[PDB]
Amino acid sequence: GSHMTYPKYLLSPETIEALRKPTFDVWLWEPNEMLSCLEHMYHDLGLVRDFSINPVTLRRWLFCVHDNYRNNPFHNFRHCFCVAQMMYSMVWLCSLQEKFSQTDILILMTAAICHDLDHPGYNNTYQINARTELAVRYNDISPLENHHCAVAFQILAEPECNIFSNIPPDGFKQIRQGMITLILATDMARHAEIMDSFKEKMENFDYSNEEHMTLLKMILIKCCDISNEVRPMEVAEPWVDCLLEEYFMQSDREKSEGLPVAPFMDRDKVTKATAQIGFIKFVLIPMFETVTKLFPMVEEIMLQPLWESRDRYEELKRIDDAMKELQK
Numbered sequence: 001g002s003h004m005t006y007p008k009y010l011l012s013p014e015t016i017e018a019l020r021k022p023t024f025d026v027w028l029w030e031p032n033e034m035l036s037c038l039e040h041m042y043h044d045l046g047l048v049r050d051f052s053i054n055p056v057t058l059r060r061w062l063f064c065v066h067d068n069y070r071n072n073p074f075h076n077f078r079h080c081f082c083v084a085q086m087m088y089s090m091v092w093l094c095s096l097q098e099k100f101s102q103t104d105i106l107i108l109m110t111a112a113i114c115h116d117l118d119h120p121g122y123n124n125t126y127q128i129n130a131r132t133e134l135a136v137r138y139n140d141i142s143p144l145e146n147h148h149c150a151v152a153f154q155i156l157a158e159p160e161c162n163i164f165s166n167i168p169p170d171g172f173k174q175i176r177q178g179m180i181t182l183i184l185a186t187d188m189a190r191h192a193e194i195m196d197s198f199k200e201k202m203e204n205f206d207y208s209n210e211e212h213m214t215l216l217k218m219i220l221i222k223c224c225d226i227s228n229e230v231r232p233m234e235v236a237e238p239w240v241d242c243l244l245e246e247y248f249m250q251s252d253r254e255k256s257e258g259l260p261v262a263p264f265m266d267r268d269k270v271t272k273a274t275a276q277i278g279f280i281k282f283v284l285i286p287m288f289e290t291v292t293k294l295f296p297m298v299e300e301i302m303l304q305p306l307w308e309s310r311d312r313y314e315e316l317k318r319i320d321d322a323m324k325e326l327q328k
């Protein structure tokens with residue numbers, strides 16, 4: 001809708017606007033356009049202003065982060081973009097700038113971007129069972145999440161990537177601690193533990209209680225991380241196949257190496273529909289239900305697409321099961 005054509009990395013006013021909503025089609029963009037989107041978020045949220053981030057350093061940092069993501073079917077730079085874009089959408093939807101400080105927004109955004117750095121495409125169960133260098137280094141304690149974290153701080157230690165260079169040491173330590181808590185909280189083995197702790201605080205929630213806010217930030221990063229099904233069907237659906245592509249690579253390797261295989265990774269046991277029905281019903285919907293108690297606007301924007309998705313996979317399951325029965 002402009003008088004002349006601008007290159008892809010110069011985001012159109014329409015893209016800038018659409019970027020604020022969970023309906024944003026994450027598939028339409030090349031890495032350079034996604035990098036421009038992430039950069040806009042830091043300026044738009046007032047993070048460049050409030051933390052005196054050098055605008056060039058922000059770009060170098062984002063480019064370095066992009067480079068440290070692997071070309072995996074799921075755990076890649078586009079996934080990193082989803083999580084950060086969903087976080088950014090949640091800041092607007094939930095009016096997080098009213099409830100959280102700029103330091104908290106910075107932690108939420110930086111942890112969302114860094115949460116899966118250098119992911120190898122094989123989960124913690126593979127690392128542990130195969131006794132990999134990562135499992136040995138981290139003593140079987142969230143090896144991947146600990147690594148994503150370490151890589152995040154290794155990038156920030158490079159002077160041309162240090163977006164925190166103008167932040168006083170006390171501020172840096174505060175951001176570092178918060179980011180470590182958030183990235184480590186993305187380990188799904190801790191889901192029930194984190195959900196229970198949050199629900200316990202939800203009995204009488206306090207926005208001025210640091211412990212309550214830490215748990216809310218952990219729940220927010222967890223929400224964003226597994227949020228694909230909140231997105232429109234056309235955007236959400238291709239992500240399941242990407243994850244299954246990664247899971248099948250792992251189970252094949254586990255079979256070959258004589259290691260235990262998880263049923264949800266077994267090509268003959270798992271179906272996209274049955275895997276998604278369960279995940280939506282027992283992981284996604286209950287998690288977003290607890291958030292809705294604090295942010296009532298999350299029901300219409302995030303629970304409604306989850307209900308629609310659950311109902312569509314139930315339809316797909318009826319057809320898929322009948323189809324798979326003819327195949328034998």
Ligand SMILES: C[C@@H]1CN(Cc2ncccn2)C[C@H]1c1nc2c(cnn2C2CCOCC2)c(=O)[nH]1
Nearest residue numbers: 188225226227228229240243244264275276279
């Ligand atoms: C098709 C996936 C099979 N999995 C079954 C399952 N059941 C119980 C426990 C674990 N998995 C649930 C499915 C699933 N996993 C997701 C999604 C998003 N992130 N993850 C994951 C969350 C974990 O970290 C990697 C991405 C999703 O939409 N579906």
Ligand SMILES: [Mg+2]
Nearest residue numbers: 115116186187
């Ligand atoms: Mg992860």
Ligand SMILES: [Zn+2]
Nearest residue numbers: 079115116225
């Ligand atoms: Zn992730």
